[PDB]
Design brief:
The complex is a heterodimer of chains A (490) and B (514). Chain A has 490 residues and is of the alpha/beta class. Chain A has 14 helices and 19 strands. Chain A has three domains: 214 residues, 3-Layer(aba) Sandwich (Rossmann fold), CATH 3.40.50; 173 residues, Rossmann fold (3-Layer(aba) Sandwich); 58 residues, Tumor Necrosis Factor Receptor, subunit A, domain 2 (Ribbon), CATH 2.10.50. In chain A, strands 9-8-10-11-12-13-14-15 form an eight-stranded mixed β-sheet, sandwiched between helices. In chain A, strands 1-3-2-5-6-7 form a six-stranded mixed β-sheet, with helices on both faces. In chain A, helix 1 packs parallel to helix 13 and helix 13 crosses helix 14. Chain A is elongated. Chain B is of the alpha/beta class and 514 residues long. Chain B folds into three domains: 249 residues, 3-Layer(aba) Sandwich (Rossmann fold); 163 residues, Response regulator (Rossmann fold); 58 residues, Tumor Necrosis Factor Receptor, subunit A, domain 2 (Ribbon), CATH 2.10.50. In chain B, the strands form six sheets. Chain B has an eight-stranded mixed β-sheet, sandwiched between helices. The radius of gyration of chain B is 29 Å and the shape is elongated. Classes of the chains: A alpha/beta (490), B alpha/beta (514). At the A-B interface, helix 2, strand 4, helix 3, helix 5 and strand 9 of A face helix 2, strand 7, helix 3, helix 5 and strand 21 of B. Strand 4 of chain A pairs antiparallel with strand 7 of chain B, so a sheet runs across the interface.
């Protein structure tokens, strides 16, 4: 199942086991993604209008998260008999593969790109988001079929604008993911009149281990700081396999009431979703990728032990990332079809150096399941995002849609109803300072602009809101006014 | 000159090198770029390594009876060009091909170690590729704390202190002099980002925590620089930490002098504590005090003569004829002035020490004795990795040792800027081995009466006052006591309810009495 001969071959790097490579707990996400790739290949073969005569094959290999990164690339780049020449011009090097469907994690993506750049071998990734991957000088041969992180942050900020929230807490993990995302969100917020109360770093731990007293003290202090501030909206940038202990600690105390705005990492996860006691902490919102049904996929998939265990979950979810692999395969197929010059029923066959496919790939345009597939100049395809709420009744899905996001417009649209946790389905409130009365001025307090105090003006003065709101003007002439008057009564 | 022909000497065991010999002044074909501009620092460092290898060969106690060799190469400070010679080092000896296998122990690399690049950016890229084969790599300039992890870089060693020791020393200075309230600023490179990430934890674990944490933009061909200083000026701090590269610091100080910013105590990194560009800026004497930490090390005292002698020898027509019996084609036309600017650099010692370390490790692994040394089959590159951890190698009468993480241990000196006219000078006031030892009567501060500046907060509001929490991580409190017009109903709830008409209450009143 990990090989099929053909005239032209494709590479694949998925994380089947991630927790030698045959020594860790299985990961079903890798399996259904690989199934998506294989299904796409067979479908292209069946059709008789995309590529007549030219068969297509694949060559898949595991990566074990960030464990195995050098051998697969050296394997893909080798004429045959496992020997790779070293020279000063690879313009006539006919490699084994013609393109790579890059790995899942960002660090592995960068490591593989730093190798494949020399040969300009096209590489498409399907789940790695980081603005550093848009620098087409360091990475001249990398493309992506999912939006970057600035769009996730934009969705967060616009959600916080729609409902009036300008007092929030941010928590981050101790790695590049959390650091970069937190810095980006801070930069974005600084320009939109929203505040940050404080920020804290979650100690890095793993499930199935024992912690020291120091880490437990750190978690206790963090939660104690959480349960003293007036902000009631927490944004968490961190990966799963670290939040179990944190949420257990929060459950141990009685911190009730908050909107937990998640991120892509743990927005859709079952293992942390099954902690039944979580339901009474507050609303849980996340940002994910909109799901596109793929006609006739469960037939190819169902027809291994872990897949059956969560087959119900893989039915409710799992369709959120397969469209990326599907689209990448089809993009490579169309680029090849354009390059070879084939027609409705005639093909030519020819030598295809890898650096030539890249030029055609850059300029593809076609429609797949009512979504256009064209690449922007930085190597991205604009796919809609989504915002999901965690529903605990098991009848319907456990991730229900609440809004849609449009990357080529930067706007949240079609916002539906959300079941809050307040008394009578009222909107939760998070603000630093309450609004002033009529006629009173503002007395600033602290360092955040959005925090202030109210003060009443004395007779002989009037407050012109159209002018300085921090100090009322002295009623001139013979006009007179008294306490709390924006108009004088000469 | 005939320098470009002296970058390859045969031997029983061949070392490899990567130096930034050249600089370069849009990819459409898979072709290697070309650099032409000449840089003197790379050539000086290459000659330092050469000096080290010749010194080893001349001696008798080290590697008795065996002769080393080298193979130097250029990186151009670019991964694309640096990958090729890296791919060559790991190849079947005598051939022009590399093989694909499942693991090491099936390869026969043609080198034995690599004296790695000077840049951390290239160090990260090359270390991952080499760690697959377990080829020992020793770098002489790369100072980043990410490279100490032994799960991603098993075969990486460095002979320059890491960035953690400097920040720990800074934290201890701050803690001893009594400065809880500070502001931390860093550059917009990986340098500054990692520096801030380390320092935040080091401070939060010692009682210090920060009022603002910002990134100073790089001069990539100005508006943001205004915002950073506004936030600093809005917190009443008399200490600012600047962990930045030279250009960001230059921009920051240019802007600050152009306007009128108040004097403050600046704690510097090693990049801009000794940079003529910053020291020469007009008006800098009105910015305040400047402290920092500088490493202590020896310096090769025959290198200046060695360079002259070997350039003169290269001039000899006879030598070039015999020498015949190009990585850098642009270094055959230089003169003594083109290198005279940097014949006292402090990293020749680092290169020299790296070479000596690899030599001693090989000596031990071969079970060489003193004058003869046992007959055995060639030592594979992955066999020296066991004698390199915990290795005590003497270089220039200064014992040194590697650790489990792969780092060496070096001391530090505390430098202060003292003005005598318009020329600043660097004096010494302290030392840092594992605990700071400062001297306080030898400091001339920037204040009127020569008294220690104060930047402090309050971590516990006394009973009878309200407390407003402040800080970037919510540590300190701004205490305020309500007048004789309200109670202190609760320790929390920062607000004072007014007394009743029948009640009476003074300032610092828990309740109003009738």
């Amino acid at each position: 199942d990990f090989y099929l001969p053909g005239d032209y071959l494709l590479g694949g790097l998925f994380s089947l086991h991630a927790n030698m490579c045959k020594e860790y707990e299985v990961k079903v996400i890798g399996y259904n993604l690989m199934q998506a790739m294989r299904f796409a290949v067979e479908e292209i073969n069946n059709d008789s209008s995309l590529l007549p005569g030219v068969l297509l094959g694949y060559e898949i290999v595991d990566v074990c998260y960030i464990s195995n990164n050098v051998q697969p690339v050296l394997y893909f780049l080798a004429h045959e008999d496992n020997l790779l020449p070293i020279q000063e011009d690879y313009s006539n090097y006919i490699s084994r593969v013609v393109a790579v469907i890059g790995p899942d994690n960002s660090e592995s993506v960068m490591t593989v790109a730093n190798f494949l750049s020399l040969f300009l071998l096209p590489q498409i990734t399907y789940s790695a988001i980081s603005d550093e991957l848009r620098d087409k000088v360091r990475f001249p041969a990398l493309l992506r079929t999912t939006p970057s992180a600035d769009h996730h942050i934009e969705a967060m900020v616009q959600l916080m604008l729609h409902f009036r929230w300008n007092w929030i807490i941010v928590l981050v993990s101790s790695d590049t993911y959390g650091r970069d995302n937190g810095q980006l969100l801070g930069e974005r917020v600084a320009r939109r009149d929203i505040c940050i109360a404080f920020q804290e770093t979650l100690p890095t731990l793993q499930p199935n281990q024992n912690m020291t007293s120091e880490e437990r003290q750190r978690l206790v202090t963090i939660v104690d700081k959480l349960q003293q501030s007036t902000a009631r909206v927490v944004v968490v940038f961190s990966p799963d396999l670290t939040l179990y202990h944190f949420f257990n600690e929060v459950l141990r105390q009685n911190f009730t009431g908050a909107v937990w705005i998640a991120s892509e990492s743990w927005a859709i996860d079952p293992v942390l979703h099954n902690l039944t006691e979580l339901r009474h902490l507050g609303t849980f919102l996340g940002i994910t990728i909109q799901s596109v049904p793929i006609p006739g996929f469960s037939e190819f998939r169902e027809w291994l032990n872990a897949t059956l265990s969560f087959n119900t979950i893989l039915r409710l979810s799992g369709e959120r990332v397969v469209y990326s692999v599907y689209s990448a395969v089809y993009a490579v197929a169309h680029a090849l079809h354009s390059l070879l010059g084939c027609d409705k029923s005639t093909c030519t066959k020819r030598v295809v150096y890898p650096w030539q496919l890249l030029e055609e790939i850059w300029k593809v345009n076609f429609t797949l399941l009512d979504h256009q597939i064209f690449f922007d100049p930085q190597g991205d395809v604009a796919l809609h995002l989504e915002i999901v709420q965690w529903q605990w009744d098991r009848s319907q899905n456990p991730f229900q849609s609440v809004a849609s996001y449009y990357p080529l417009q930067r706007q949240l649209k079609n916002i539906q109803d959300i079941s809050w946790h307040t008394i009578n389905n009222t909107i939760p409130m998070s603000m630093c300072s309450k609004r002033c009365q009529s006629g009173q001025k503002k007395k600033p307090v602290g360092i955040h602009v959005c925090c202030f105090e109210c003060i009443d003006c004395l007779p002989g003065t009037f407050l012109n809101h159209t002018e300085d709101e921090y100090e009322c003007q002295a009623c001139p002439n013979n006009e007179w006014s008294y306490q709390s008057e924006t108009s004088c009564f000469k | 000159l005939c320098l470009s022909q002296q970058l390859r000497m045969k031997g029983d065991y061949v070392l490899g090198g990567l130096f930034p010999l050249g600089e370069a002044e849009s990819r459409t074909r898979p072709s290697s770029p070309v650099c032409t501009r000449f840089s003197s620092n790379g050539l000086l460092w290459a000659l330092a390594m050469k000096m080290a290898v010749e010194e080893i060969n001349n001696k008798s106690d080290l590697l008795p009876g065996l002769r080393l060799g080298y193979d130097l190469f250029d990186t151009c400070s670019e991964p694309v060009v640096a990958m090729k010679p890296s791919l060559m080092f790991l190849a079947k000896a005598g051939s022009r091909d590399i093989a694909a296998y499942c693991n090491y122990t099936q390869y026969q690399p043609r080198v034995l170690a690599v004296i790695g690049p000077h840049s951390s950016e290239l160090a990260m890229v090359t270390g991952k590729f080499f760690s697959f084969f377990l080829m020992p790599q020793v770098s002489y300039g790369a100072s980043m704390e990410l490279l100490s992890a032994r799960e991603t870089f098993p075969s990486f060693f460095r002979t320059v202190p890491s960035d953690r020791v400097q920040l720990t020393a800074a934290a201890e200075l701050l803690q001893e002099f009594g400065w809880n309230w500070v502001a931390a600023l860093g550059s917009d490179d990986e340098y500054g980002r990692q520096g801030l990430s380390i320092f935040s934890a080091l401070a939060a674990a010692r009682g210090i925590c920060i009022a603002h944490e910002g990134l100073v933009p790089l001069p990539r061909a100005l508006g943001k620089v205004q915002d950073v200083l506004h936030q600093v000026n809005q917190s009443s701090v008399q200490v600012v930490l600047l962990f930045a590269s030279v250009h960001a610091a230059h921009a920051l100080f240019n802007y600050s002098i152009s306007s009128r910013l108040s004097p403050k105590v600046w704690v510097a990194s090693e990049a801009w504590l000794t940079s003529d560009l910053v020291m020469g800026l007009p008006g800098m004497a009105q910015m305040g005090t400047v402290l920092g930490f500088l490493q202590r090390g020896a310096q090769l005292h025959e290198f200046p003569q060695y360079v002259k002698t070997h350039l003169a020898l290269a001039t000899d027509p006879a030598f070039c004829s015999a020498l015949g019996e190009q990585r850098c084609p642009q270094c055959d036309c230089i003169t003594l002035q083109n290198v005279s600017a940097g014949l006292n650099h402090h990293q020749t010692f680092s290169v020299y020490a790296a070479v000596y370390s690899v030599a001693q490790a090989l000596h031990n692994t071969l079970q060489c004795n003193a004058s003869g040394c046992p007959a055995q089959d060639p030592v594979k590159p992955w066999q020296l990795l066991e004698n390199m951890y915990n290795l005590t190698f003497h270089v220039g009468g200064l014992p040194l040792r590697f650790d489990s993480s792969g780092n060496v241990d070096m001391e530090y000196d505390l430098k202060l800027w003292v003005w005598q006219g318009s020329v600043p000078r660097l004096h010494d006031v302290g030392r840092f081995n594992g605990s700071l030892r400062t001297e306080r009567l030898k400091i001339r501060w920037h204040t009127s009466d020569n008294q220690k500046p104060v930047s402090r907060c309050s971590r516990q509001c006394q009973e009878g006052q309200v407390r407003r929490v402040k800080g970037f991580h919510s540590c300190c409190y701004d205490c305020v006591d309500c007048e004789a017009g309200s109670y202190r109903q609760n320790p929390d709830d920062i607000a004072c309810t007014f007394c009743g008409q029948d009640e009476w209450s003074p300032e610092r009143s828990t309740r109003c009495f009738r």
